[PDB]
Description:
Blueprint: H1 4-15, E1 25-27, E2 54-60, E3 63-64, E4 78-80, H2 83-86, E5 100-104, E6 115-118, H3 123-138, E7 150-157, H4 161-168, E8 193-207, H5 223-227, E9 237-255, H6 263-270, H7 281-287, E10 289-296, E11 304-306, E12 330-338, E13 347-353, E14 365-372, E15 376-386, E16 394-399, E17 411-416, E18 421-431, E19 439-445, E20 453-460, E21 465-470
Parallel strand pairs: 1-13, 14-20
Antiparallel strand pairs: 2-13, 3-12, 4-9, 5-6, 5-8, 7-8, 8-9, 9-10, 9-12, 10-11, 14-17, 15-16, 15-18, 18-19, 20-21
PDB class: sugar binding protein, toxin
Keywords: beta-CFT, toxin, Sugar binding protein
Assembly: monomeric
Amino acid sequence: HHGSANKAVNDFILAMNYDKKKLLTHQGESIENRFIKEGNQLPDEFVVIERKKRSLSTSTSDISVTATNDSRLYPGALLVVDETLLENNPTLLAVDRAPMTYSIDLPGLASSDSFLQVEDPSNSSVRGAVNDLLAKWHQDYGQVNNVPARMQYEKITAHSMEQLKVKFGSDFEKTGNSLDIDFNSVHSGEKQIQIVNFKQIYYTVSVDAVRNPGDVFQDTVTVEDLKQRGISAERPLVYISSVAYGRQVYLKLETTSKSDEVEAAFEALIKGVKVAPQTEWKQILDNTEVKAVILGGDPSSGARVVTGKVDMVDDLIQEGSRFTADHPGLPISYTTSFLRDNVVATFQNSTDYVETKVTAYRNGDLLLDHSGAYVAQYYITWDELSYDHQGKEVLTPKAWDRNGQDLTAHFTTSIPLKGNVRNLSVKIRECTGLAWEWWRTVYEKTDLPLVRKRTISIWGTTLYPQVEDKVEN
């Protein structure tokens, strides 16, 4: 502005030519898994894994923040555009700055003096400017009613730690690593997981468009000083054009189960006051469930890692639902704009993942009771399933120990089966003592269904056998 240095600085930037899209793309990896696999052992139920690769490509302009005391995330701030910016750890360009005018969008001022001037932008001045206003709004408002926080929720079922980054931000670890997350237990086919990111905005602070690239500096600054800090074209500049300020929860859910109507549990659980009347399946699921949850927000400092089950008990959802300027909020996300032209910077982050689907097949028992006045015989055959390599399959047949044996009395045994069991046949003859018909076949199903507890129960007399076929799922 007027002085020959600034002007030269202004030319510099304006003249910059570069690829806004080839600079804001970060990458992880791909390597192809052929599909294949399948096949798995068990404990108290038998699964088939099978891992079918998939592809995550996000692009936003809003950047999640999992900091609090991050001194370089203030609106106005210039960031360099280089590898560290993609990773959410940007090289800050402190350099003598000119003043700025920020807007602020909460209710109680609409236009009148919902504006602010700062002489030297910095985390401090800009905070202390804000925190001044948040008083005279508490002094007019906040205590007017519940000024309510604008919520915004997102989900992803897990699959890998990196693929999570591409959903929640190039900086997830210091949150990930904290929620205790076991994928060794989901490429096994054991656990299955989903992760929520609840956001609660109280207010937002933003910057009108910079009319000239020079305008952001002071006349003390030269191009030489910018070159000396590595700005190029190759490494241009953005400015933090907006910041939203509030509370955040990241939150991870894991269950024993594998019901292919599990997702449904959550979505309706999340909706809060949506108890279901016990008994249910979209309620058994939740009762075998264990959380871990991080709060960045409301009482400023660091994070609150916390766990509980749900039993709805963890409803911190509406914890910070009301604003009112008691304690301000911390910064949750921000936006950047190139200085050259005020174009919002838009980051395209991609990776493809190790995607592992799972499938049911519980395992019950078959129980026999013989309380008949006669002799009987069981022929009980089946096929035990597995997958070796390529998967394909492996049906090695099998057969009860007492096939053939004559059983009397009151005989009971419980033959237990597992999920891979298939082609289960069961035959039962009783013996009549009639010369022309030695045996009645009294029961004979092929491909019995596999159930928690089938119990076949034969009784009665030689000429008048009774049979109960009882399933119990």
